[PDB]
Amino acid sequence: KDVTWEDIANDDKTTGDVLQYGMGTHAQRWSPLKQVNADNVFKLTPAWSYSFGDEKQRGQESQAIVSDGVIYVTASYSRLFALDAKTGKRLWTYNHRLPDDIRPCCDVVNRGAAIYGDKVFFGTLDASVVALNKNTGKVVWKKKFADHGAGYTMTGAPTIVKDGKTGKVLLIHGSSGDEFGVVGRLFARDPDTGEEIWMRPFVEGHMGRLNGKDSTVTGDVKAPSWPDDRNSPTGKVESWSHGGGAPWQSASFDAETNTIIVGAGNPGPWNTWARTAKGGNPHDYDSLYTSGQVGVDPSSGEVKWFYQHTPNDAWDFSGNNELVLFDYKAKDGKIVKATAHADRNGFFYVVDRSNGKLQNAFPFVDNITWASHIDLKTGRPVEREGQRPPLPEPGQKHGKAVEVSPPFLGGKNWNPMAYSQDTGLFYVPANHWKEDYWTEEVSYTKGSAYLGMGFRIKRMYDDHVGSLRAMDPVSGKVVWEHKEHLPLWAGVLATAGNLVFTGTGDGYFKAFDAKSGKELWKFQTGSGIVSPPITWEQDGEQYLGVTVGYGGAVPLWGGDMADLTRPVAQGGSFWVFKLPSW
Amino acid sequence: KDVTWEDIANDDKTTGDVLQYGMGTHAQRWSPLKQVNADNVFKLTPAWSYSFGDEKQRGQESQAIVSDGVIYVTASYSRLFALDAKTGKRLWTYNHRLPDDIRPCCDVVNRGAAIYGDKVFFGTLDASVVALNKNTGKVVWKKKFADHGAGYTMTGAPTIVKDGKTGKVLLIHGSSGDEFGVVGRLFARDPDTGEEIWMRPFVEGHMGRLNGKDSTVTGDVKAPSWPDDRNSPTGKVESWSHGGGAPWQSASFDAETNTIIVGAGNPGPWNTWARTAKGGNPHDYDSLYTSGQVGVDPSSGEVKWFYQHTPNDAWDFSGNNELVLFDYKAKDGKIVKATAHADRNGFFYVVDRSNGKLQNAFPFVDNITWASHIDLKTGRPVEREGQRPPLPEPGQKHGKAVEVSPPFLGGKNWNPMAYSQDTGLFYVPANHWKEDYWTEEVSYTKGSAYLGMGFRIKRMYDDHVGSLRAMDPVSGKVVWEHKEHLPLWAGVLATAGNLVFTGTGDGYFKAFDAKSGKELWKFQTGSGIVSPPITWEQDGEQYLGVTVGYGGAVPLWGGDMADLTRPVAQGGSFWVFKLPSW
């Protein structure tokens, strides 16, 4: 029974393995383990550490995968290490040869692998997907799906899913490069051959694929949501061919409706005026299928439903953060099967997963300015006056700067949130900060960044940046807050030991009490932590795993925040923690 | 009063700080701490780690030093780190700018800093000595003492001395470069200005310096132990200008007699025939002042005595391993104030530190092929029949191969031994291995290696390479042995808790019982360990620390042992360990 569909399907229930990004199909980041709890945490201790070496460091975002005592882990610069759960012995490794003309936007990171049958899977920075035998380090198949030289890569974990209609098992993966003016795409593949079953673009009017040849087209062909141009070949504006909406994070899956649930990324160029008719109003010129959660049909890759989070993303509020399936108990009576999401744009969304109908929406980060709230009968944010920054005055190649919050780095970025089955709360790794944003000149050039805006990131408050927050999904309340001097960039994990775990920027692994927020335990690993920890049972013992090594976007795009973070050291390791055997 | 001569001189007794390489002027690597002992050692646990980062890894050989609350540690590629001893937080860093064309022979490593007054001191890879303010890392002075382009470097810890006659405090340091054809030199400098007080060459007939002016000649001017050459401009064979005997490790210091006791390295080239008269006998052409232990006068830099380990070192048995100072209770009767040494050539020596006379010699490794024993009245090896390899028969471009053991890597390399004041034993980090050796052509070419020989290192035994042995210095017996699969390439620490500590090439920091040799405790750190561990007490707690990050000579010169070692991960980091509070 070596990695079957039901092992995957049951994966949030079985404490002795971890088979995918999220610790379940619902991506709840929850575990029923209680060996480690709030009265004995004070004793947690490192069991062993593995260093990735090779003189290759930079950000380490990977969530590890454990199956039958082998941790499968990914490292920067497209590597995969297979390790003995109990000792930290190395079993095998794979190194991808990386061309010299790669261009990932926000550091050479990788977020995980998937296991199915006897194979291990992961995406690579030159835009490929590789399959390896879980026992050997032997490559079984490789497919390169896009031109890296034009801006594509892959940084996110792939997932496995089963079509409840056709019976087939699929490998689901996304793509990356909104910043480079790429057309984002979603894909399905055959696990044993890596052959393209289906391909689906997420900018409105683009041509999708099915069993090898073209199929249908995403929405209307005329593409009413993007501005027309009766001079260019397409009739549409240039941005239309460089639109964006790339799903650079991972899917989530619901067996009960036979639906894939995935986020779409920000549209291209950043500038709202490249995607609005001259003269014109950026209010209903939505850049259809960008910066929202998309419901997808497993059998054909056609769009089932869609709930957009920033109708005309002027700010790069990339709206593809993760979707956790929970049971929403309205506010009195009706349990609703829902999606939950803590977006880049500062608000928390409760969406009906049966059809993408908004149920509750509210802020999770303090002083928001681009929007006052989300108008519930309409599903649309109610913006503020100067928040789409104005075009330059005649003669100026830069326009007037406006103070926005949150900044493009967001209220929360990809690092992921956990759901607690016992307390009902979502534990969100958020940040408090803002920026100056201003318009510049916009034009597309293959292999170049395609923003069209200028920016600077800066503090919001004097005493802190990172904000661990316990949010109640029905009332929209902050049950508790833990504050930190550096930003927060690690995932969170919740357990039936009444514990919350995460890592910080200055290198500690920490444990928090899940009802009150009190700091109970920390350990200094030696580099800032930017990944999601996991936990598991092994031959009767509770284990914790965290990947260590600072990186990601802050160092390269953070502004003041790059400066704060200059003294954090680089690293590259995996660490396993547990209770002393003696 | 911050770090005075009296702090340094009582350095072996003060459990509170660590001020120099060897944890005392006698280099014993002995601690009277007993908090951690043979009955409670199984609870020892990591306290914190620090990552060196910079994407700069390779071999990490440093001995940390401690005082007030701060750890000063050295890293690969010339870098110095000051760390808070309780927390591991970084206080300051100093990165030396290195040129692109340095040429260390045996990896980019450093063995430690020294300390005196308000200053820290260390050698750099472009052959310089640097002085840093202790409280911050600003540079006070820095002296480039030789040319790196011609092959000089520095890798060994400097040390601090007080000349008893003159009252003056000196900074003592050596040089490195025997494989490139250099004149090995020892230097004494003023601690506050960096100013050369004296310079002594360890090749016979070369000129010294005293107060910036030429002083005296080492030994006889005519250098009779080096072959003559009418028709040469110097009067001597070419190799006398490139003769070696560099003091690449560190001094020991005896205040009772006022003597600086150090090792001199191997002669250059390895080829015995370039240091023998055409058609003469390698015997008595000695290659004076190479591969032995030297007693030197701190006042003038002059040689007081010399004991040769290998007289015409044909094997690169670099004869400068550490010298420990101890009291030798003869065999029966006498207490001799002695030197203790475990040579690269595989013989342990015991010598009288007042006059350089041989008291005893026996083998600490098992299958020595180059010499039968050491003749106790003569002081000389009794060499075997064809163990200096023969020249190429006329027309050949390499001579025939002979099997030698130990090989140039040694029975013991630099990785120092330790002594137990309780048990009376030496704990040596030895290895069993051997090689095929043969002759090639020899020619000097500035900035390029000067061997004149071919070689191939090979295992001796199928079940183990590394051999951790407890040696009795009065009878010559191996009282206990512990065996390891990979080479042994770290230092040893000995304590009053009945314990000896060391690190292995597969990444374990280990504890053994000192009286019987049993492994009691082990922790997996992530990469191979190649540094000497220390210990110190702070706020009633006993800390252990160790530098981690595999490297050194094996992965480059090791041959079959370069391939055994291939899958051991690089790293770079410091680790501190302690007993659990509860």
Ligand SMILES: O=C(O)c1cc(C(=O)O)c2c(n1)C(=O)C(=O)c1cc(C(=O)O)[nH]c1-2
């Ligand atoms: O739209 C994109 O196509 C794209 C890709 C990624 C990435 O692939 O990691 C980043 C982003 N977006 C992005 O906006 C960004 O702020 C972000 C930060 C991180 C990071 O790993 O810390 N990844 C990315």
Ligand SMILES: O=C(O)c1cc(C(=O)O)c2c(n1)C(=O)C(=O)c1cc(C(=O)O)[nH]c1-2
């Ligand atoms: O003769 C020299 O001048 C020289 C220096 C060093 C060095 O400086 O590290 C090595 C050697 N010798 C040496 O023989 C060699 O065996 C060696 C091993 C190592 C080590 O760090 O791994 N260095 C040295």
Ligand SMILES: [Ca+2]
């Ligand atoms: Ca599971």
Ligand SMILES: [Ca+2]
């Ligand atoms: Ca983006």
Ligand SMILES: [Ca+2]
């Ligand atoms: Ca001391």
Ligand SMILES: [Ca+2]
């Ligand atoms: Ca040498």
